[PDB]
Amino acid sequence: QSALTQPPSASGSPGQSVTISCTGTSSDVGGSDSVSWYQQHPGKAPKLIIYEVSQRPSGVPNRFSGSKSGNTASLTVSGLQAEDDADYYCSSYGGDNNLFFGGGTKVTVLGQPKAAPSVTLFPPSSEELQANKATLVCLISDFYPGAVTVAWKADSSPVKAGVETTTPSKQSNNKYAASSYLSLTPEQWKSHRSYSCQVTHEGSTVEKTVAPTECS
Amino acid sequence: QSALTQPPSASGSPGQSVTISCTGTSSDVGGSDSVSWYQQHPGKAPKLIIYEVSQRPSGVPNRFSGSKSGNTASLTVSGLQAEDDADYYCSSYGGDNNLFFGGGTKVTVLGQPKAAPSVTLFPPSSEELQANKATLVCLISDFYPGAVTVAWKADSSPVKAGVETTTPSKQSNNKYAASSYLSLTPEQWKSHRSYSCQVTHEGSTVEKTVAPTEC
Numbered sequence: 301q302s303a304l305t306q307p308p309s310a311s312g313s314p315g316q317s318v319t320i321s322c323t324g325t326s327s328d329v330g331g332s333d334s335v336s337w338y339q340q341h342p343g344k345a346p347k348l349i350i351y352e353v354s355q356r357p358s359g360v361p362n363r364f365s366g367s368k369s370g371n372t373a374s375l376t377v378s379g380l381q382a383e384d385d386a387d388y389y390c391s392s393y394g395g396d397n398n399l400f401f402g403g404g405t406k407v408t409v410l411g412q413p414k415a416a417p418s419v420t421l422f423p424p425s426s427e428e429l430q431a432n433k434a435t436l437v438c439l440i441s442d443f444y445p446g447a448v449t450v451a452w453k454a455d456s457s458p459v460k461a462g463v464e465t466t467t468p469s470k471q472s473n474n475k476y477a478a479s480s481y482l483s484l485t486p487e488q489w490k491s492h493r494s495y496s497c498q499v500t501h502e503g504s505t506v507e508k509t510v511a512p513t514e515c516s
Numbered sequence: 517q518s519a520l521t522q523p524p525s526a527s528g529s530p531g532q533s534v535t536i537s538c539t540g541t542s543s544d545v546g547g548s549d550s551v552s553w554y555q556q557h558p559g560k561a562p563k564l565i566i567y568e569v570s571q572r573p574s575g576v577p578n579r580f581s582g583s584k585s586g587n588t589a590s591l592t593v594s595g596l597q598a599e600d601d602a603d604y605y606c607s608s609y610g611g612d613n614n615l616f617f618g619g620g621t622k623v624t625v626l627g628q629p630k631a632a633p634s635v636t637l638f639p640p641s642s643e644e645l646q647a648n649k650a651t652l653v654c655l656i657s658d659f660y661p662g663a664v665t666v667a668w669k670a671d672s673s674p675v676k677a678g679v680e681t682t683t684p685s686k687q688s689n690n691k692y693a694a695s696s697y698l699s700l701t702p703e704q705w706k707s708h709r710s711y712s713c714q715v716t717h718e719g720s721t722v723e724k725t726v727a728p729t730e731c
């Protein structure tokens with residue numbers, strides 16, 4: 301994980317407000333007035349937009365404001381404009397391990413209607429199992445905005461290793477698709493009660509589960 | 517407001533060294549030892565590789581070394597590996613709570629090894645078939661460089677409708693992955709002897725075939 305917790309994505313339409321949060325502990329976010337926020341347009345240098353929870357550097361419009369309540373800092377962007385479409389990171393001093401960062405929130409300025417993802421979960425194919433592979437694929441299509449977070453479970457347990465998710469890409473219908481794949485051994489696949497794919501889009505999570513069958 | 521100065525690009529072959537510079541002013545880079553370097557893979561959070569000019573955080577290999585002379589910080593990456601191919605940003609605090617960032621250097625690791633796609637074709641899931649859907653997925657992973665073409669067959673005949681292929685994306689092994697998905701009805705899927713996914717990469721084609729289940 302990242303050391304501070306940010307929600308992976310947030311969205312608004314032009315001229316609306318968005319608040320994104322940054323959660324730590326009493327020793328980092330809640331121990332001082334040291335929260336910073338940074339804005340990054342993809343493939344461009346990031347920029348500091350807030351320091352000391354609330355302070356705007358020269359040239360940052362007052363549409364951006366920062367606040368904090370105990371262990372959670374918040375950035376509010378009022379009057380969303382096209383240029384506000386970017387990734388936002390927070391940071392806190394932690395005293396003991398110096399500077400701690402969140403994992404970034406992708407903020408989308410809605411360019412089209414919101415669309416919830418179609419999630420399909422494929423158990424291992426016969427051919428790959430005869431090749432000693434039990435890779436599962438979680439197909440995620442037809443969503444907007446193009447920001448999705450994928451988690452896998454082995455039974456109820458988070459599974460960390462063997463997960464890859466493709467960078468969502470705009471398809472012919474102008475909505476996004478991605479696939480997540482989990483590279484299991486046939487042993488792992490057959491020996492568990494189930495595997496699940498959990499897909500989070502626009503602050504809402506969808507889950508699909510598959511289990512081994514006698515046949516294919 | 518002003519960026520720190522980085523060259524837009526640099527490069528090295530595997531095992532070689534690259535050195536990249538970050539030029540500020542006497543009031544930022546030249547004014548204290550608060551220079552940081554970050555590594556960023558496109559579409560991912562950055563990783564801190566150096567803080568306070570020279571210091572590697574936990575888990576950053578000793579291949580990454582940071583120095584400063586006057587107003588210019590330098591990062592040297594030695595024994596270059598595919599994973600080092602990335603954008604590198606420098607930062608420096610100045611006066612008045614200012615934080616300055618470089619424009620970023622894209623470091624290319626030259627001559628990365630060609631890799632043929634692993635192709636896995638999945639017939640419709642039980643769940644989607646119960647929901648009156650028969651989408652097939654052709655998973656395409658572990659290929660390099662990141663350009664593939666995908667054609668589908670229904671029995672031996674070209675499929676001209678219903679195909680989406682995602683734009684290849686670099687995964688954590690530094691090789692490309694994509695999925696092709698064919699949106700069939702349960703009727704289309706069951707009315708054919710098989711469906712085939714043909715993946716073309718660097719003039720070479722891999723074909724996989726699936727058929728309605730007998731279970």
Ligand SMILES: CC(=O)c1ccn(S(=O)(=O)c2ccccc2)c1
Binds near residue numbers: 402605
């Ligand atoms: C984990 C870590 O150290 C992080 C996370 C965000 N940032 S940054 O906002 O200074 C940034 C630096 C370089 C490129 C993009 C953003 C640093």
